[PDB]
Amino acid sequence: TGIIMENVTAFWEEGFGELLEKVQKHSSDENNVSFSHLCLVGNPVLKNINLNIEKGEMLAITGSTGSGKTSLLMLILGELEASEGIIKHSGRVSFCSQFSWIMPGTIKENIIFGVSYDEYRYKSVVKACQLQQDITKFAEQDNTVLGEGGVTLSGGQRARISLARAVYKDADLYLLDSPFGYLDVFTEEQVFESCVCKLMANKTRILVTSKMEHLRKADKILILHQGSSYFYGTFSELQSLRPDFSSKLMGYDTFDQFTEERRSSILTETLRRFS
Ligand SMILES: Nc1ncnc2c1ncn2[C@@H]1O[C@H](COP(=O)(O)OP(=O)(O)OP(=O)(O)O)[C@@H](O)[C@H]1O
Ligand SMILES: [Mg+2]
């Protein structure tokens, strides 16, 4: 149907760490991580993961920083293998990574990169990703040549082009890894509404996020901590079965407009108090 994981565990295997680094602050937290040692010692990166996501549902994945969110995505992509447990999903998947990549060419060439052009499809993706506001600032609009790896664009601009590229792909499952992590916080709110909630309402999709509105709108929710499932279920269930986490995070007035670093800090801290 959509995607199922039953009691899945995945161990550190050689090369997986380098892959994670190739995508591309608590980097000071990571400074005696040795990917070799994790492989020697036999260590789960993800442990006892369960989820059942139906066709057209949206799973929101959140958690503490370094909890295995991207790794779970990689597991779906087949870059990590389940050592225990069952994973079912079929069909093409489309992946939007944390690192926004940009190829030599026009904005438009970037969004349809490697895929056939369809005008209604294109115009539709451009609009829902809120790119119309960006391209209208340029003399050649979406025919603007990105005369770098889009280096002179904003981080949000690069993230929107990269989102639009993944959303434009025709696929059965969309993996969206933290597109909404930048300062232009009102644009991100329109994008989430227009792209992820409306245009994609019937696409099975997984959104890694650190905003509570995304948990609120989600069909299902996975919270990760230290490579384990801190919680899995609906937003209603989260308020009942994790009441301490919930009231803390809904306690804020405008949590979703804090920086990405601050939201991830509060999430991480909250997950530790309440074990
Ligand atoms: N670049 C890196 N260097 C060293 N250790 C890393 C790096 N990226 C991830 N890790 C470690 O590998 C496991 C985590 O990664 P994943 O990359 O799956 O985290 P996330 O859950 O995606 O978190 P975040 O997005 O906040 O980094 C964790 O135990 C984490 O500490
Ligand atoms: Mg990540």
PDB file of all heavy atoms in Angstrom, residues 10-27:
ATOM      1  N   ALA A  10      18.517  -1.969  12.211  1.00  0.00           N
ATOM      2  CA  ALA A  10      19.589  -1.865  11.219  1.00  0.00           C
ATOM      3  C   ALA A  10      20.914  -1.477  11.869  1.00  0.00           C
ATOM      4  O   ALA A  10      20.987  -0.532  12.658  1.00  0.00           O
ATOM      5  CB  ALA A  10      19.214  -0.851  10.142  1.00  0.00           C
ATOM      6  N   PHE A  11      21.959  -2.220  11.533  1.00  0.00           N
ATOM      7  CA  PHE A  11      23.253  -2.049  12.173  1.00  0.00           C
ATOM      8  C   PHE A  11      24.143  -1.160  11.319  1.00  0.00           C
ATOM      9  O   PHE A  11      23.915  -1.038  10.108  1.00  0.00           O
ATOM     10  CB  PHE A  11      23.928  -3.386  12.399  1.00  0.00           C
ATOM     11  CG  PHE A  11      23.236  -4.253  13.416  1.00  0.00           C
ATOM     12  CD1 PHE A  11      22.804  -5.526  13.081  1.00  0.00           C
ATOM     13  CD2 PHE A  11      23.028  -3.797  14.716  1.00  0.00           C
ATOM     14  CE1 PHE A  11      22.178  -6.336  14.018  1.00  0.00           C
ATOM     15  CE2 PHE A  11      22.396  -4.608  15.665  1.00  0.00           C
ATOM     16  CZ  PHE A  11      21.976  -5.876  15.307  1.00  0.00           C
ATOM     17  N   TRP A  12      25.141  -0.538  11.964  1.00  0.00           N
ATOM     18  CA  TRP A  12      26.194   0.205  11.271  1.00  0.00           C
ATOM     19  C   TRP A  12      26.975  -0.767  10.409  1.00  0.00           C
ATOM     20  O   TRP A  12      27.477  -1.790  10.891  1.00  0.00           O
ATOM     21  CB  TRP A  12      27.140   0.902  12.252  1.00  0.00           C
ATOM     22  CG  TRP A  12      26.598   2.155  12.842  1.00  0.00           C
ATOM     23  CD1 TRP A  12      25.845   2.273  13.972  1.00  0.00           C
ATOM     24  CD2 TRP A  12      26.763   3.485  12.331  1.00  0.00           C
ATOM     25  NE1 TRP A  12      25.528   3.592  14.199  1.00  0.00           N
ATOM     26  CE2 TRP A  12      26.077   4.356  13.204  1.00  0.00           C
ATOM     27  CE3 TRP A  12      27.426   4.021  11.220  1.00  0.00           C
ATOM     28  CZ2 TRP A  12      26.031   5.728  13.003  1.00  0.00           C
ATOM     29  CZ3 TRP A  12      27.383   5.375  11.021  1.00  0.00           C
ATOM     30  CH2 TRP A  12      26.690   6.218  11.906  1.00  0.00           C
ATOM     31  N   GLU A  13      27.070  -0.433   9.131  1.00  0.00           N
ATOM     32  CA  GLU A  13      27.849  -1.213   8.160  1.00  0.00           C
ATOM     33  C   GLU A  13      28.899  -0.262   7.557  1.00  0.00           C
ATOM     34  O   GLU A  13      28.697   0.952   7.504  1.00  0.00           O
ATOM     35  CB  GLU A  13      26.915  -1.776   7.086  1.00  0.00           C
ATOM     36  CG  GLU A  13      25.908  -0.712   6.549  1.00  0.00           C
ATOM     37  CD  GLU A  13      24.671  -1.285   5.799  1.00  0.00           C
ATOM     38  OE1 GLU A  13      23.687  -1.703   6.471  1.00  0.00           O
ATOM     39  OE2 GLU A  13      24.685  -1.292   4.544  1.00  0.00           O
ATOM     40  N   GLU A  14      30.024  -0.811   7.120  1.00  0.00           N
ATOM     41  CA  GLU A  14      31.073  -0.007   6.497  1.00  0.00           C
ATOM     42  C   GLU A  14      30.582   0.886   5.369  1.00  0.00           C
ATOM     43  O   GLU A  14      29.884   0.431   4.461  1.00  0.00           O
ATOM     44  CB  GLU A  14      32.167  -0.887   5.972  1.00  0.00           C
ATOM     45  CG  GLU A  14      32.993  -1.515   7.054  1.00  0.00           C
ATOM     46  CD  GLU A  14      34.284  -2.137   6.504  1.00  0.00           C
ATOM     47  OE1 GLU A  14      34.684  -1.760   5.359  1.00  0.00           O
ATOM     48  OE2 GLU A  14      34.881  -2.997   7.223  1.00  0.00           O
ATOM     49  N   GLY A  15      30.971   2.158   5.428  1.00  0.00           N
ATOM     50  CA  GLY A  15      30.699   3.068   4.327  1.00  0.00           C
ATOM     51  C   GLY A  15      29.491   3.939   4.580  1.00  0.00           C
ATOM     52  O   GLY A  15      29.354   5.033   3.998  1.00  0.00           O
ATOM     53  N   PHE A  16      28.618   3.470   5.472  1.00  0.00           N
ATOM     54  CA  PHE A  16      27.378   4.165   5.744  1.00  0.00           C
ATOM     55  C   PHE A  16      27.657   5.535   6.352  1.00  0.00           C
ATOM     56  O   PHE A  16      26.983   6.516   6.032  1.00  0.00           O
ATOM     57  CB  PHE A  16      26.466   3.328   6.646  1.00  0.00           C
ATOM     58  CG  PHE A  16      25.196   4.017   6.996  1.00  0.00           C
ATOM     59  CD1 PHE A  16      24.247   4.284   6.018  1.00  0.00           C
ATOM     60  CD2 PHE A  16      24.988   4.511   8.269  1.00  0.00           C
ATOM     61  CE1 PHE A  16      23.119   5.038   6.298  1.00  0.00           C
ATOM     62  CE2 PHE A  16      23.862   5.275   8.563  1.00  0.00           C
ATOM     63  CZ  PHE A  16      22.927   5.539   7.572  1.00  0.00           C
ATOM     64  N   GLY A  17      28.650   5.615   7.228  1.00  0.00           N
ATOM     65  CA  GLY A  17      28.991   6.904   7.820  1.00  0.00           C
ATOM     66  C   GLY A  17      29.485   7.954   6.828  1.00  0.00           C
ATOM     67  O   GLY A  17      29.141   9.127   6.919  1.00  0.00           O
ATOM     68  N   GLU A  18      30.295   7.525   5.869  1.00  0.00           N
ATOM     69  CA  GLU A  18      30.822   8.410   4.832  1.00  0.00           C
ATOM     70  C   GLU A  18      29.686   8.919   3.934  1.00  0.00           C
ATOM     71  O   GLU A  18      29.657  10.099   3.556  1.00  0.00           O
ATOM     72  CB  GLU A  18      31.880   7.688   4.012  1.00  0.00           C
ATOM     73  CG  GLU A  18      32.125   6.233   4.454  1.00  0.00           C
ATOM     74  CD  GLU A  18      32.943   6.130   5.751  1.00  0.00           C
ATOM     75  OE1 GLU A  18      34.021   6.775   5.813  1.00  0.00           O
ATOM     76  OE2 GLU A  18      32.505   5.410   6.694  1.00  0.00           O
ATOM     77  N   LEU A  19      28.746   8.022   3.618  1.00  0.00           N
ATOM     78  CA  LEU A  19      27.554   8.396   2.875  1.00  0.00           C
ATOM     79  C   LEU A  19      26.802   9.489   3.609  1.00  0.00           C
ATOM     80  O   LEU A  19      26.350  10.448   2.994  1.00  0.00           O
ATOM     81  CB  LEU A  19      26.660   7.206   2.666  1.00  0.00           C
ATOM     82  CG  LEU A  19      25.361   7.561   1.945  1.00  0.00           C
ATOM     83  CD1 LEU A  19      25.524   7.299   0.465  1.00  0.00           C
ATOM     84  CD2 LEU A  19      24.187   6.732   2.503  1.00  0.00           C
ATOM     85  N   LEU A  20      26.669   9.344   4.928  1.00  0.00           N
ATOM     86  CA  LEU A  20      25.936  10.322   5.735  1.00  0.00           C
ATOM     87  C   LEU A  20      26.652  11.677   5.729  1.00  0.00           C
ATOM     88  O   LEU A  20      26.029  12.735   5.903  1.00  0.00           O
ATOM     89  CB  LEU A  20      25.764   9.831   7.163  1.00  0.00           C
ATOM     90  CG  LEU A  20      24.652   8.868   7.486  1.00  0.00           C
ATOM     91  CD1 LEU A  20      24.749   8.485   8.948  1.00  0.00           C
ATOM     92  CD2 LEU A  20      23.308   9.524   7.218  1.00  0.00           C
ATOM     93  N   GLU A  21      27.966  11.643   5.554  1.00  0.00           N
ATOM     94  CA  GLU A  21      28.742  12.870   5.569  1.00  0.00           C
ATOM     95  C   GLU A  21      28.689  13.504   4.193  1.00  0.00           C
ATOM     96  O   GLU A  21      28.831  14.720   4.053  1.00  0.00           O
ATOM     97  CB  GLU A  21      30.184  12.599   5.937  1.00  0.00           C
ATOM     98  CG  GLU A  21      30.493  12.624   7.408  1.00  0.00           C
ATOM     99  CD  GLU A  21      31.937  12.234   7.661  1.00  0.00           C
ATOM    100  OE1 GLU A  21      32.499  11.524   6.778  1.00  0.00           O
ATOM    101  OE2 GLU A  21      32.495  12.639   8.726  1.00  0.00           O
ATOM    102  N   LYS A  22      28.537  12.658   3.184  1.00  0.00           N
ATOM    103  CA  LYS A  22      28.453  13.115   1.820  1.00  0.00           C
ATOM    104  C   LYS A  22      27.198  13.928   1.602  1.00  0.00           C
ATOM    105  O   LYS A  22      27.175  14.764   0.700  1.00  0.00           O
ATOM    106  CB  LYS A  22      28.494  11.970   0.854  1.00  0.00           C
ATOM    107  CG  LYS A  22      29.589  12.119  -0.182  1.00  0.00           C
ATOM    108  CD  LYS A  22      30.892  11.492   0.275  1.00  0.00           C
ATOM    109  CE  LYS A  22      31.195  10.259  -0.565  1.00  0.00           C
ATOM    110  NZ  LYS A  22      30.064   9.298  -0.505  1.00  0.00           N
ATOM    111  N   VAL A  23      26.158  13.697   2.408  1.00  0.00           N
ATOM    112  CA  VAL A  23      25.034  14.631   2.455  1.00  0.00           C
ATOM    113  C   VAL A  23      25.530  15.926   3.138  1.00  0.00           C
ATOM    114  O   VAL A  23      25.771  15.975   4.356  1.00  0.00           O
ATOM    115  CB  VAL A  23      23.812  14.014   3.211  1.00  0.00           C
ATOM    116  CG1 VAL A  23      22.611  15.001   3.219  1.00  0.00           C
ATOM    117  CG2 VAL A  23      23.419  12.687   2.549  1.00  0.00           C
ATOM    118  N   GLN A  24      25.665  16.969   2.312  1.00  0.00           N
ATOM    119  CA  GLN A  24      26.573  18.116   2.510  1.00  0.00           C
ATOM    120  C   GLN A  24      27.869  17.869   1.711  1.00  0.00           C
ATOM    121  O   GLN A  24      28.941  17.717   2.352  1.00  0.00           O
ATOM    122  CB  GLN A  24      26.883  18.376   3.987  1.00  0.00           C
ATOM    123  CG  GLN A  24      27.752  19.622   4.255  1.00  0.00           C
ATOM    124  CD  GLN A  24      27.392  20.829   3.374  1.00  0.00           C
ATOM    125  OE1 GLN A  24      27.785  20.886   2.213  1.00  0.00           O
ATOM    126  NE2 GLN A  24      26.651  21.796   3.931  1.00  0.00           N
ATOM    127  N   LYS A  25      25.090  24.424  16.438  1.00  0.00           N
ATOM    128  CA  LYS A  25      25.556  23.171  15.765  1.00  0.00           C
ATOM    129  C   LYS A  25      26.348  22.283  16.722  1.00  0.00           C
ATOM    130  O   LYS A  25      27.288  22.734  17.420  1.00  0.00           O
ATOM    131  CB  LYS A  25      26.397  23.501  14.534  1.00  0.00           C
ATOM    132  CG  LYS A  25      27.168  22.318  13.958  1.00  0.00           C
ATOM    133  CD  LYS A  25      27.828  22.667  12.625  1.00  0.00           C
ATOM    134  CE  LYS A  25      26.799  23.048  11.562  1.00  0.00           C
ATOM    135  NZ  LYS A  25      26.556  24.532  11.471  1.00  0.00           N
ATOM    136  N   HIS A  26      25.957  21.009  16.721  1.00  0.00           N
ATOM    137  CA  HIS A  26      26.491  19.992  17.621  1.00  0.00           C
ATOM    138  C   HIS A  26      27.395  19.007  16.864  1.00  0.00           C
ATOM    139  O   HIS A  26      27.303  17.777  17.020  1.00  0.00           O
ATOM    140  CB  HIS A  26      25.329  19.313  18.346  1.00  0.00           C
ATOM    141  CG  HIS A  26      24.583  20.252  19.246  1.00  0.00           C
ATOM    142  ND1 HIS A  26      24.854  20.784  20.488  1.00  0.00           N
ATOM    143  CD2 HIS A  26      23.465  20.881  18.801  1.00  0.00           C
ATOM    144  CE1 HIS A  26      23.935  21.687  20.787  1.00  0.00           C
ATOM    145  NE2 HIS A  26      23.080  21.763  19.782  1.00  0.00           N
ATOM    146  N   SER A  27      28.268  19.586  16.040  1.00  0.00           N
ATOM    147  CA  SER A  27      29.373  18.859  15.433  1.00  0.00           C
ATOM    148  C   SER A  27      30.487  18.681  16.467  1.00  0.00           C
ATOM    149  O   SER A  27      31.254  17.714  16.401  1.00  0.00           O
ATOM    150  CB  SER A  27      29.875  19.580  14.170  1.00  0.00           C
ATOM    151  OG  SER A  27      30.642  20.745  14.564  1.00  0.00           O
TER     152      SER A  27
END
